[PDB]
Every structure is written in C-alpha cells, then in structure tokens.
Amino acid sequence: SAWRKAGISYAAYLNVAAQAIRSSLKTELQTASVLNRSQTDAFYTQYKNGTAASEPTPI
Amino acid sequence: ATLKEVEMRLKSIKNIEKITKTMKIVASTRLSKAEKAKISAKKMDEAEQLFYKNAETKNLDKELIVAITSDKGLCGSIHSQLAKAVRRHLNDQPNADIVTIGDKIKMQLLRTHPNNIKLSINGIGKDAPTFQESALIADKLLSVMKAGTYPKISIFYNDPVSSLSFEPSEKPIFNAKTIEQSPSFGKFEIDTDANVPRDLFEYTLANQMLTAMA
Amino acid sequence: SSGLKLQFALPHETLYSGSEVTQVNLPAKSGRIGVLANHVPTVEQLLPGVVEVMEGSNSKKFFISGGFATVQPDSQLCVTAIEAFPLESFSQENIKNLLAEAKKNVSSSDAREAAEAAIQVEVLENLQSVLK
Amino acid sequence: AAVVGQEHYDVASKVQETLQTYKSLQDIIAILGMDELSEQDKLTVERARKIQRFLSQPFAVAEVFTGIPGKLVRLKDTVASFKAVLEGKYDNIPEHAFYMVGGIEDVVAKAEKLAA
Amino acid sequence: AAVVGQEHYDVASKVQETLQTYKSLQDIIAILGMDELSEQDKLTVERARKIQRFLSQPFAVAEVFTGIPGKLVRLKDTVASFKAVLEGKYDNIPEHAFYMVGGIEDVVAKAEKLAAEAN
Amino acid sequence: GDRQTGKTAVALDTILNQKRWNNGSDESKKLYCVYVAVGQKRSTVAQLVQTLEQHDAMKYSIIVAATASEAAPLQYLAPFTAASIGEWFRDNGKHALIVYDDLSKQAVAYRQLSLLLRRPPGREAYPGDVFYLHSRLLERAAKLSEKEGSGSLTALPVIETQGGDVSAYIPTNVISITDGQIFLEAELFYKGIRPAINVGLSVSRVGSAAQVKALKQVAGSLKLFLAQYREVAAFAQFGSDLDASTKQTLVRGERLTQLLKQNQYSPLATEEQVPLIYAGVNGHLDGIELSRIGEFESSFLSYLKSNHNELLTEIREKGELSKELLASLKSATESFVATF
Amino acid sequence: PTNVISITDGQIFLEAELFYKGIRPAINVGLSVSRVGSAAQVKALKQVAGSLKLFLAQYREVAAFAQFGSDLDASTKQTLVRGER
Amino acid sequence: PPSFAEQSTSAEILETGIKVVDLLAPYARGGKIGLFGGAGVGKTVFIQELINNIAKAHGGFSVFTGVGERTREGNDLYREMKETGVINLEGESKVALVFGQMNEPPGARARVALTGLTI
Ligand SMILES: Nc1ncnc2c1ncn2[C@@H]1O[C@H](COP(=O)(O)OP(=O)(O)OP(=O)(O)O)[C@@H](O)[C@H]1O
C-alpha cells in the first residue's frame, strides 16, 4: 500500500512479492531452488568514516 | 635431509596434489552450476540494458563505489586486481564513498582506504546469488546509504573474459534524476503519474547488482 | 515486425527471448494492458497478476510477481520480472489462506513488518483471483 | 571392552577415531585453511582439539615448571568427562579453557574463570 | 657496526632479512605463486627479487662469456645503492633492469634503455 | 604390516574358524593348525594358549615356542622344526595350516648367528643366504598330488615392517617369495577399521581359483565397488557437489567399509558372510544410517537365523548360488531392510 | 648430538634462520629447554615470566594459522601482537 | 660370447605375429626385450602366444628359464603348457624348460640362466 513512504523500495516490493508467490507454492513443486532462492543469509555491517562497526545484522 | 624428512614431505605433497585435484573438480562442478545463474542474470539484464541503449541515459557532471568479490579467496589475481581497479578509479575521486560486497575485497580496500568504506556485506560467496539477496541489498542502499542522493554510481565486478582469462570491469548506474533528463527518453511513452523513473532506477540497481554478483 | 519479439525474462530462467508473439496481456500500473504486434515504445511497471500470452498458438496463462514491461522501439516488448507460474498447480488454497491469516496478523505489527505483510495480503488476495 | 567396560571402550574408540580424522584433515587446513571444510568437519576439528588439550594434566612433580598443582583424576570422572565431550556438551566452551586441567568440573571452573 | 660503520651493518642486516623472508616464502611461491601473498609480503618478494638480480655483477674476466665490460663498483656507492633499494626508491623500475649491472646509476641507465627500446 | 595391528589376531581368528570342521568328521575338510611363536615373550604365548583354551582350539593346536628368553639357534631352528611337523600331516593326505609369527625376529636371530660366526655380512649386515633361508622354508608348504594323496600345507608368515616400508631388505625378499600379501595399515586401525586391511595392496596370485563359489559370484562386484570408491573417497571431505553416481559410490563405499569392521574373536561362517555381501552390493543398505550397520548386520543375521536358516544351510552345503537362492535371498534382504 | 643431548641438563638451540631474521641471539624457544629450569631462576624474574614460555609456544602455534593469512578474532590477534612485540 | 667379427651388422625386425608388438615396439632379430608387468595379466598367456607365433612364423624354438621361479607357479605353468599344446608329451613339444627353483642355493640360481643360454 504505502510501502513507498513506510515500507519497502520497489525492488524490495517485488522481492516481498516474490517471497509471497514462492510462499504460496505447491509444496510438491516448491523445489530446493525455491528455498535457496529465499535463503536470505547476507549480513550487512555499516562502517563509518573512521571504519567503525555496526551490527552484522541479518538482512 | 634424512630419508624420514624427504619421505614425510613427499607424502605431504602427494596429499596436497590429491586435495588440489579434488578441489579443481569441485570448482569445475560449481563453475558449471554458476554459468547457468550468470546467463539467466545476463539475459534478464539485457532486456533493461537494451532500453538504456535506446533510451540514452548518459549523465552529465561525491560518488558511490561498489566492489564485488566473495568472502573466500584462493582465486588468484582477482582480489588484488579488482582492488587495483578500485585504486585506479579512486585516485580520480578520493572523496567517493565505498560499499564493499565481499570480505576479501573489504580487507584489500580497508588497508588502503578505511575512510570511504561505510557499509560492508558479508555471507555472499557460498552460493549463486539470488534476486532476493540482490534486491534486499539494493533496498539497504536506499535505506542506510541513500544512493539516489549520490550523483554518480559505479559498480565494480569481475568479467570472465574466458575460462582462462578475466577482467575487473566497471558499470555505471544512472540515477532517476538522469532518467527524466535523458535525451532519448520522450521517445519512450511514460506515465508522469506513476513514479516510473523513481522505481525503474531501483529496478536497475537491483538488476545490475545481481548481474555484477552473478 | 510481423508479430512481435517477446523477451520474457526472469532471474532464474528467461523463458521467452524475442519469441514471436501476437498478443501479450499484462497487469501493469494502469491495469491490465493487452499489447499486439505493434505498440508505442512505452515503459510500465507491472503489478503482480495474470499475464496471458497469446501467440500464433493459443494463449498461455501465467502469474507474475510484478516487474517491468518495456517496448523496445523495434517492436520488442521486454517483460522483465521474477516469478513464472503454471496453470494452477503451484497455487494451493491451504498454502495461501493459512499464510494469509498469519500475514493479516503480521500486518498488525510494526510498520516495517506491517507494510510488507499488507503487501503479502494483497498478493495472496490477488492470487485468490488465480484460485478464481 | 570385556575388561575396561564396553562404554569406556567405545568412548576411547571414538576419541581415537576423532583424533585420527583430525590428523587426516591436517593437510588441508595447513594449506587451504579452515574454510574449505564442512560444518560437521569443522565441528570435528574443534572437538578433536578440545579432546587434545583436555588431555593436558598438571603434575605435582612438574609444579616447579608450571606453578600449577597436580591433578589426580580418577577413572570414573575421566570416563564421564570424555563422554560429555564426545557428546559435545561443552562445544560452546573454548579450547583454551581445557589446557592443563583436571576433571570436567575443573573445566567448568576454568571456563567461568576465563569470563574475566 | 663498529668496524664497517653502523649504516653498512644496518643495510646488510635488512638485506639478509629480506632475502631470508623470500627464501621462507619460496615454497608457497612454488605452490601458489605471488597471488596468494599478503601485499606487504608481495612487496617484500618483489623487492627481494629486484635485489637478487642487482647482486649480479659483470666481470672483466668473464667478458668472453658476456661481451660486457667489467664493473669495479666502489663500496660507498654500493652501500647507498642498496640503501635506496631498501628504501624502495626504484620499485617502479622493473626487475630486469637490475640484472647484471654496476651501480644504481647503471640501473637507471638500463631502465632508460629498456624504456627506450621495449617502449 | 607394521607392529601391533592384529596380524596375530588375524591369524588367531583364522585358526579359531576351524572349530566348524574339526568338530565335524571330514578330514579332507578338516584343518590342523600350528602356531609358531618366534622371538616373543612368554606371557603373550601363555595368554594365547589360554585364549585357545577359551574356545577349545587346543583340540587341534600345536604350539612351537621360540621366545626371546631362548637361545638364538632355537629361534633359528624352530620354523624348520614346525615345517617338518606340518610336513608330517602333509604326507598323510591331510590339511595343515601353519602360521609363522614372525619371520623378522627369526631373520634377526640368523643374522646374529652368522655375524658371530664371522661370515661376511651383506646389506644391513644380513647374510647372503637369508633369502635362501626363507625360500628353503616356504616352499615346504604345498598342495600334493592325488598320486601322492593330495596333502596340503599352507603357510601364513608374518612380516613386521618398519615405518610401513616394503623397500627394506627382508620384506622385499619375502614379498618376492610369497603368493601375495595381506597388507595392513595403522591408520585404518585408528579409523577403527578392524581388521585394518588395505585392499588396494593386498592381492593373491592364486585368488579366485580357490574361493567359495557362492562367495565368488557376488564378491567380484565388491572389488569393483571398492576400486571405484578408493579413487573417489577424497571427495567426501567437501560439500554436496557430487553427482548421484559418485555420491552413490561414497554411499556404497562407506557402508561396505562399515560392514568390514568386525571384532576380534568373531569368526563368521561363509553362509553368514554371503548375505551381508549380497545386501551391501545390491544397495539395500543405502538408506540405512551409517552407525547402525554393524548392529543391523547382527540383527540381520538373527533374522536369517530365525526364518531362512535352511537357505543358509543350502549355501553352506552347496557353496554356490542357485537362482532360487538369489531370489529368496533378495526376498529376505528387502524384507529385513523394510522391517529395519 | 644424539649422544650429547642425552647427557646434558638441557639444551640451547640456535637456528641460523632466525639470525638472518635479525633475532640476535637466534634462540629457538620451541626447542631450547632447561631440564632444571625455574628452580634456579631468579625469583623476581620468575614472578614476571611465570607463564611466558608456554605463552610464546601457543603464540607460535596460533600464529601458524595467521601464516595462512585468514582473519582471526581480537583475542588471538591480541596474542599475535603481544607475542610479536 | 661370439666374436666381434661374427656380429650381424644390422638388426632386422623379428616378425613376431602379434599386431601391437610388430607395430609399436618391434623386436630385433636377436635382440633384448624388457617385459614389465605383474602376474594375472595373461603374461604367461602372452608368452605362450609368442611361442606359437614363432613356431608357426619362423619355426625356431623356445627355451624358457625360470630363475627363482615359484615352484607351484612353475607347476601351473608346465601344466598349462601341456594343455595349450606347446608341450606335447607324445608329439613335438616346441619348447625346452629349465626351472631353477627358489629353494636352490645361489650358486644354482646364478647359473640357471647360463644353462638356458647354452641350450
Ligand atoms: N578386529 C579387532 N577387534 C578388536 N580389537 C582388535 C581387532 N584387531 C586388532 N585388535 C587389537 O589390536 C591390538 C594389536 O593386535 P595384536 O597384538 O595381534 O598385533 P600383533 O599382530 O600381535 O602385532 P605385534 O606382534 O606387533 O603386536 C590388540 O590389542 C587387539 O585387541
């Protein structure tokens, strides 16, 4: 709805759309490429100008 | 120089060559797997980049630099070569802030320029990258970095020229401000009332990130 | 061209790439748009819905999770999106509705979760039209 | 096993095989590092070094060398100690908290000591 | 250092440290190569291999093996030459210009010849 | 092989199998055993004799003691002494197995005798004729003619290698003499492979000419699976980047390996060993967990000792595989795999 | 040397490789031991180096993992720094 | 040994009969052949095929010499050579056998080769 103001970016909007589509899978047809395609395992760490550290959080 | 030293050493090196042979075979299997993802990302990206060939989005006139390696190493002159391309482009604009994707290029760049690095992405090189991951990181760039504010965006990836050769390669990203300013842009019919450049720029960022990673 | 070059592209498998096609039918920002062999060069963001691709053969019915339809000016329409879909087999009501109730529950959470869960409720209710 | 007890025999056997797999994997990690292994493989490497440094034992004779009083560790404590380590109950505890230690209670004592 | 001068002793000390470092890294160079080094180690290997070719010296006696006039290179110039090499003032100059050379001025001359000829 | 690897235990349980026939009646299928302890300690020998009493192997055992207490020419003459003892049975149209354990101490004793007798030494101070020693020894074991009466003396010598070396002079000599090796390794024993047989080196030039045909008709695949598996098994220290062919090869290789681990003092009849090989070759164990295999086996044995015992007796009596045997064998195999 | 090390009350071992690495004197800590050791050491010197030798041993042990050139935590990196100093 | 004057000054090719031998590694008529390979590969089958191919082709005979041959394996060899017909116990055996067994002192085994040589 108001994801542009409050929620996601449009790439992330379609990402949540893909997570809902693959979340609405046939469990017979939900292959390992689907679950690995949703295997969100990237860790982001905000550094600073003094190369400080943030939390390596699960994106 | 005993028989014992030379014997144990030769047995160790035989074990080493056996392990490198198995590693080469596993590398061939993973490379054959990853070519599918590379082609399926490239053919998706070409459908949007042929548009940028037609809609000539060529910008004019602070800069964001994104480099792409993995967390692991053991691939030779890649982590240092791409860092040397970073050196080439960063000597031009030393004010250009850096967001690395890959632990090894982060250690390459943090020793030489810890100043410009402001976001680091980890947990990457285990698998072929997915659009879920790439779109998520592109969302994070317009959440903690706000790259639409940045005038010029460069993506640094590694182009396999062959299986036996390579290239560290640069890809420019044009912000959505440039997209309405494009000369070959009114040729394409676009709704003013749908934020199509301001979302297609995000879609461009996500696709170019996915293509650079894959 | 006689017909049209469809470049139907996905991150995992680009299905059509310049496939010669008579009609595409796609849910974009302005609604369901059917485009024939010729069209204005036009860029549209695509809402998640049912794409019907009619060719010299019959018309296939896919679901799409949103994306972009861009008419390359040589009459090459590029659909650039994420999800393909069978006739109805990948769609399952027990999978959709039991998650949809939980997604309405997560839509009561914080706005980072609430907006996304509202999107997910919207997508599952659009998929209810695929359940049809 | 008919002499020293079937369970103790199996515990020593699993310790033996664990250390043998460790010594086997010593060629890769010296060259290609820890990263190339599997998670079960790295778990086995961890637990093997755990058992390895858990064999360290201070000596009252060697107390002039270590400054550490000797531990006379009994058999039935030792059996259950290696049993719990093979079951991986203390995988969270780092390997440094096993060096020159008597029983598993002294393991817990050094592990809580190294909180500082 | 109280015999040859302190600076001579220090220069020779750093040269032996650099070459010992190279000889230590030799096996990893044999297996993996220079790519799997750290950059400090890679710079050290580069400088040491420059030094090794710089060690070679044209002989007036073995001129029939070389066609090259012999090089009677003085001591203090040699000390300052290895000093500037340990300081890395000539890391830009490639390794081959160090080979079979006289003083550091001759390395400059040979690098000029390679720049003018190899181009 | 090297030291302390159950070589003695291998030959010991080899003797202990012969309860199955020496308690019977057919002398042409019976087998009398002569263990030859050379250069050992008295406690080990008495422990062995007590162990033979614990299974009543002293019914058919003959022990020749050449311990390290004894003089060097006693240790020299004791293998030939037991050789004459075995030749007595051999020239009765009978069947005798002898086990020399070892020959390395015996070679050391003969070396000492010759060096103190001021004979000129050769390589590693050995005499020249020491090869002539063992060649004069081991050829005394044979298989006689029906004209003679078809007696049979069979020899199991033991070579204690040093550091896992065959290039040493005495092991090179014995390898040049014998009909192939049963080679052991320490590392496999530390992987708990008991007995720790390197199949990749142990051969028999006789081989399949004197194997049980029921075992023969399933065993030929097994050598092929293991030869495949040893080429591939370095892949096991990686992820799942293997195709189902090589991952199936890992599955078969690990499970057949886990079959071959067995305990000391565990002699298994051939009627017992056949269905284990039939099940392991034919992929029935592939779904079974790696840990349970050895007890699975045991339960499997009890299953066949519960329900298909007549099939086992038919295996033991014929020594071959009928098509009905293969059918009912795979029937019971899939049956117990299903109920396990 | 196999005879002599069997005799003495400890050994002092002097790899020339360390001497070329500027370590003067070039004492291999991992091999040069004292069979008596601390019992005749100065006690003030004992109190300040009561665990120093085994610390340098495990420094060189863990430091071998850093020769691979992988990332290590600040505990091991701290011990690396202190043992290097 | 025969004199230097009695040496045939050009080695022709001994035509064996086997395709691979006559193709790739041709044998000198009166030459030396190093056969490698362990048992179980039909090496005895190979050499019996050589015996028959020489008997049919050139008509010359074969002299086998087992120096240190395993006496059991010598027996199996002799039994096979009876069965494959190169030894005919009543008709014309095409081969002469000398077996210095392993149980013979080294004075025998350093002369078994010369015995087969003289034959
Ligand atoms: N299948 C097995 N099951 C249980 N234990 C075994 C098995 N095989 C070997 N062992 C153990 O290995 C140890 C060594 O065996 P053994 O003493 O027979 O070696 P060896 O052949 O006598 O060699 P050496 O004469 O050098 O000692 C024994 O204590 C035995 O218990």
PDB file of N, CA and C and ligand atoms in Angstrom, chain D residues 9, chain F residues 3-9 189 194-195 262-264, ligand 1:
ATOM      1  N   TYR D   9      35.320 -48.409  26.581  1.00  0.00           N
ATOM      2  CA  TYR D   9      35.970 -48.851  25.356  1.00  0.00           C
ATOM      3  C   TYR D   9      35.470 -48.074  24.152  1.00  0.00           C
TER       4      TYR D   9
ATOM      5  N   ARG F   3      53.741 -52.992  13.346  1.00  0.00           N
ATOM      6  CA  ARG F   3      53.540 -53.659  14.615  1.00  0.00           C
ATOM      7  C   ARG F   3      52.154 -53.388  15.177  1.00  0.00           C
ATOM      8  N   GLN F   4      51.683 -54.344  15.977  1.00  0.00           N
ATOM      9  CA  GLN F   4      50.538 -54.198  16.870  1.00  0.00           C
ATOM     10  C   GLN F   4      49.261 -53.894  16.098  1.00  0.00           C
ATOM     11  N   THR F   5      49.110 -54.573  14.971  1.00  0.00           N
ATOM     12  CA  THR F   5      47.956 -54.339  14.121  1.00  0.00           C
ATOM     13  C   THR F   5      47.088 -55.572  13.965  1.00  0.00           C
ATOM     14  N   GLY F   6      47.076 -56.466  14.944  1.00  0.00           N
ATOM     15  CA  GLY F   6      46.173 -57.591  14.895  1.00  0.00           C
ATOM     16  C   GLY F   6      46.520 -58.642  13.878  1.00  0.00           C
ATOM     17  N   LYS F   7      47.738 -58.599  13.330  1.00  0.00           N
ATOM     18  CA  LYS F   7      48.232 -59.658  12.457  1.00  0.00           C
ATOM     19  C   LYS F   7      48.138 -60.995  13.162  1.00  0.00           C
ATOM     20  N   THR F   8      48.641 -61.026  14.398  1.00  0.00           N
ATOM     21  CA  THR F   8      48.470 -62.168  15.276  1.00  0.00           C
ATOM     22  C   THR F   8      47.001 -62.459  15.508  1.00  0.00           C
ATOM     23  N   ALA F   9      46.188 -61.415  15.673  1.00  0.00           N
ATOM     24  CA  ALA F   9      44.759 -61.620  15.879  1.00  0.00           C
ATOM     25  C   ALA F   9      44.082 -62.133  14.616  1.00  0.00           C
ATOM     26  N   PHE F 189      43.308 -48.871  11.310  1.00  0.00           N
ATOM     27  CA  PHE F 189      43.019 -49.299  12.669  1.00  0.00           C
ATOM     28  C   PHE F 189      42.700 -48.116  13.562  1.00  0.00           C
ATOM     29  N   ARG F 194      38.687 -52.706  11.556  1.00  0.00           N
ATOM     30  CA  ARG F 194      39.252 -53.866  12.225  1.00  0.00           C
ATOM     31  C   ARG F 194      38.687 -55.097  11.534  1.00  0.00           C
ATOM     32  N   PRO F 195      39.504 -55.875  10.815  1.00  0.00           N
ATOM     33  CA  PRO F 195      40.942 -55.719  10.567  1.00  0.00           C
ATOM     34  C   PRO F 195      41.282 -54.619   9.566  1.00  0.00           C
ATOM     35  N   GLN F 262      34.899 -55.475  12.075  1.00  0.00           N
ATOM     36  CA  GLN F 262      34.363 -56.512  12.937  1.00  0.00           C
ATOM     37  C   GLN F 262      35.306 -56.738  14.100  1.00  0.00           C
ATOM     38  N   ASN F 263      34.816 -57.469  15.085  1.00  0.00           N
ATOM     39  CA  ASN F 263      35.555 -57.585  16.320  1.00  0.00           C
ATOM     40  C   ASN F 263      36.567 -58.711  16.238  1.00  0.00           C
ATOM     41  N   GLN F 264      37.527 -58.649  17.143  1.00  0.00           N
ATOM     42  CA  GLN F 264      38.411 -59.772  17.365  1.00  0.00           C
ATOM     43  C   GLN F 264      37.604 -60.900  17.992  1.00  0.00           C
TER      44      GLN F 264
HETATM   45  N1  LIG I   1      39.019 -56.926  14.972  1.00  0.00           N
HETATM   46  C1  LIG I   1      39.504 -56.450  16.140  1.00  0.00           C
HETATM   47  N2  LIG I   1      38.678 -56.228  17.180  1.00  0.00           N
HETATM   48  C2  LIG I   1      39.135 -55.764  18.353  1.00  0.00           C
HETATM   49  N3  LIG I   1      40.427 -55.495  18.594  1.00  0.00           N
HETATM   50  C3  LIG I   1      41.357 -55.680  17.640  1.00  0.00           C
HETATM   51  C4  LIG I   1      40.942 -56.183  16.333  1.00  0.00           C
HETATM   52  N4  LIG I   1      42.051 -56.270  15.588  1.00  0.00           N
HETATM   53  C5  LIG I   1      43.089 -55.862  16.358  1.00  0.00           C
HETATM   54  N5  LIG I   1      42.668 -55.509  17.579  1.00  0.00           N
HETATM   55  C6  LIG I   1      43.514 -55.020  18.679  1.00  0.00           C
HETATM   56  O1  LIG I   1      44.758 -54.545  18.177  1.00  0.00           O
HETATM   57  C7  LIG I   1      45.791 -54.843  19.113  1.00  0.00           C
HETATM   58  C8  LIG I   1      47.036 -55.332  18.405  1.00  0.00           C
HETATM   59  O2  LIG I   1      46.785 -56.656  17.966  1.00  0.00           O
HETATM   60  P1  LIG I   1      47.972 -57.720  18.036  1.00  0.00           P
HETATM   61  O3  LIG I   1      48.597 -57.634  19.400  1.00  0.00           O
HETATM   62  O4  LIG I   1      47.503 -59.045  17.492  1.00  0.00           O
HETATM   63  O5  LIG I   1      49.020 -57.151  16.984  1.00  0.00           O
HETATM   64  P2  LIG I   1      50.095 -58.235  16.539  1.00  0.00           P
HETATM   65  O6  LIG I   1      49.547 -58.870  15.305  1.00  0.00           O
HETATM   66  O7  LIG I   1      50.407 -59.099  17.728  1.00  0.00           O
HETATM   67  O8  LIG I   1      51.352 -57.330  16.169  1.00  0.00           O
HETATM   68  P3  LIG I   1      52.585 -57.296  17.187  1.00  0.00           P
HETATM   69  O9  LIG I   1      53.139 -58.696  17.190  1.00  0.00           O
HETATM   70  O10 LIG I   1      53.500 -56.273  16.584  1.00  0.00           O
HETATM   71  O11 LIG I   1      51.945 -56.841  18.468  1.00  0.00           O
HETATM   72  C9  LIG I   1      45.272 -55.936  20.022  1.00  0.00           C
HETATM   73  O12 LIG I   1      45.269 -55.457  21.365  1.00  0.00           O
HETATM   74  C10 LIG I   1      43.853 -56.187  19.576  1.00  0.00           C
HETATM   75  O13 LIG I   1      42.972 -56.206  20.695  1.00  0.00           O
END
